[PDB]
DNA sequence: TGGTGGTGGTGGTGGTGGTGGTGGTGG
């Protein structure tokens, strides 16, 4: 996301794509171990990223495309 | 401040309908 931000700020690129938001691990998770909580870090990271990108995208007139994946909820 | 992610198949029910006639013996 910081590559995306620093690229958009320059006004050079006209389209950016992120191949899946289901692959953007938080840092602490990468260096931790399997089975740890790592509760809601991804959500906080994504919210901050949007809050900080919406408007730099506008100024630079860039179009940013996300791809996602389907998961299912238990207990519904 | 900010949400995650689907498990595992179970047990059989009921019987139908009959077809065809051979061969005379003693004065």
UniProtKB/Swiss-Prot annotation:
GO BP of this protein: cell motility; DNA damage response; DNA recombination; homologous recombination; recombinational repair; response to ionizing radiation; SOS response; translesion synthesis
GO molecular function: ATP binding; ATP hydrolysis activity; ATP-dependent activity, acting on DNA; ATP-dependent DNA damage sensor activity; damaged DNA binding; DNA-binding transcription factor binding; single-stranded DNA binding
Residue span relative to the full protein: 127 to 202 of 353
Recorded family membership: Belongs to the RecA family.
Gene disruption: observed consequences: Triple mazE-mazF-recA mutant cells no longer undergo an apoptotic-like death upon DNA damage characterized by membrane depolarization.
Keywords: ATP-binding, Cytoplasm, DNA damage, DNA recombination, DNA repair, DNA-binding, Nucleotide-binding, SOS response, Stress response
Main location: cytoplasm
Compartments reported by the entry: Cytoplasm
Induction text: Induced by DNA damage, repressed by LexA. Induced in response to low temperature. Sensitive to temperature through changes in the linking number of the DNA. Induced by cold shock (42 to 15 degrees Celsius) (at protein level). 5.1-fold induced by hydroxyurea treatment (at protein level). mRNA levels are repressed in a mazE-mazF-mediated manner.
GO cellular component annotations of the record: cytoplasm; DNA polymerase V complex
Source organism of this protein record: Escherichia coli (strain K12)
The name this protein goes by in its record: Protein RecA
Quaternary state and interactors: Polymerizes non-specifically on ssDNA to form filaments; filament formation requires ATP or ATP-gamma-S. Interacts with and activates LexA leading to autocatalytic cleavage of LexA, which derepresses the SOS regulon and activates DNA repair. Interacts with the C-terminus of RecB, facilitating loading of RecA onto ssDNA at chi sites. Interaction is decreased by ATP.
Function: Required for homologous recombination and the bypass of mutagenic DNA lesions by the SOS response. Catalyzes ATP-driven homologous pairing and strand exchange of DNA molecules necessary for DNA recombinational repair. Catalyzes the hydrolysis of ATP in the presence of single-stranded DNA, the ATP-dependent uptake of single-stranded DNA by duplex DNA, and the ATP-dependent hybridization of homologous single-stranded DNAs. Mutations in this gene were selected in directed evolution experiments for resistance to intense ionizing radiation (3000 Gy).
